[PDB]
Design a protein around this ligand. Structure first.
Ligand code: 3TN
Ligand code: 3TN
Lengths: 211, 10, 211, 10
């Protein structure tokens, strides 16, 4: 069983620029673990599988969250630290292109369709339960949990937005953009580490370790 | 991955 | 209007290891242009937009095609040149990990759900009509075409496989894997170019040019 | 991108 009510509850329960951005990322990794434990059935997976799923998904999970947090922000993002970061600041820090991808492919699209918190929660749970994650002791089990989330999401969309038959597909079709953006943000982060100027705190640094 | 394991334990 | 019959027709109309793989990729780029022209409304987009969409999507488009071609192959892929490439050969050429991702995230999953050619065609058309592609003269127009494809795909799935209510979502949820795999294959290709040992023919080389 | 343009033209 995978009730959207429980997923919404998980979201509600947890509610230069590059230095501040990395600080926010590290901060939210702690909260991300708290979020995942509140998603039905996650805590009952083997510990090693919970580790695999969070290591695979954390960046996409956190990016989805800050993007949705930013829907009422004009040309910017709102960090978990309470700092608003504008386009101009990202551009003047040498990270304009990737910032603009976040704005155009995620934030603006979330804004334009008025993606709600239940929908965001469900998309994040789908990302969490990624059965393609390498090393899972039982991928089939994770696949089944993903299937339950998306079944519940579709039923939710059909019930709440009956006049929008395309909405469920529209939600799912932001996931390729999220995947690509997560990968690019990760690439930048490895570079920040490599150059060694930008402070990277312990949890964020741990996520940059090899498996 | 000691931080993640510790947090997921409790 | 976006009939699945026309999309199926487009598919049917076009029907060391690394050197052979690159040869196949270049070969299929020519055929890919022929495929795209057969997808409803693509040829009526501005020429520059057709260029943008193919430059953005070609790798995902070609990977989806060879993966589906390979569903009856055991632990391998069948290239457009008629060469079967086994896991062992990819591994012994230093590209095992990415090859295995193709097998486990695409080929095996296509096999297990018996993804048909209409479904493959529709997924490819969705990839083709990527409204997030940078520089499009009218992204809204491309978005509308994507929407028509996925509406037609859902109706098709509901009609042909009524006993599989999750199937449409299942299809769409291979797109993040396809995105990630496309990016990784591209990264390898840029490396082959950089090292300069592997022959890369003209069309494949053109795809590696800056915009 | 001359090959692509040529093929898409006709
Ligand atoms: C450190 O991870 C990043 C890097 C970036 C960016 C974001 C993040 C990042 C931030 C967070 C912050 C989350 C929050 O504040 O809730 C989480 C994961 C992340 O990968 C954006 C897209 C804002 C700008 C480009 C860069 C590469 C500097
Ligand atoms: C040159 O593009 C590649 C590279 C790879 C690979 C595939 C391709 C590739 C092949 C094709 C061949 C298509 C066909 O034969 O129909 C098209 C686009 C591509 O990116 C696989 C996943 C097979 C193995 C790893 C490498 C990185 C060598």
């Amino acid at each position: 069983d995978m009730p959207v009510e429980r997923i919404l509850e998980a979201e509600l329960a947890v509610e230069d620029p590059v230095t501040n951005i990395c600080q926010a990322a590290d901060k939210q990794l702690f909260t991300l673990v708290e979020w995942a434990k509140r998603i039905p059935h996650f805590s009952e997976l083997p510990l090693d599988d919970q580790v695999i799923l969070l290591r695979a998904g954390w960046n996409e999970l956190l990016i989805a969250s800050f993007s949705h947090r930013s829907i009422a922000v004009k040309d910017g993002i709102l960090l978990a630290t309470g700092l608003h970061v504008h386009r101009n600041s990202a551009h003047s820090a040498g990270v304009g292109a990737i910032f603009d991808r976040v704005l155009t492919e995620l934030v603006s699209k979330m804004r334009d369709m008025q993606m709600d918190k239940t929908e965001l929660g469900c998309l994040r749970a789908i990302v969490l339960f990624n059965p393609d994650s390498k090393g899972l002791s039982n991928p089939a089990e994770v696949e089944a949990l993903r299937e339950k989330v998306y079944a519940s999401l579709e039923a939710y969309c059909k019930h709440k937005y009956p006049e929008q038959p395309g909405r469920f597909a529209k939600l799912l079709l932001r996931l390729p953009a999220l995947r690509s953006i997560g990968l690019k943000c990760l690439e930048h982060l490895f570079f920040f580490k490599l150059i060694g100027d930008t402070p990277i705190d312990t949890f964020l640094m741990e996520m940059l370790e090899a498996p | 991955h000691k931080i993640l394991h510790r947090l997921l334990q409790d």
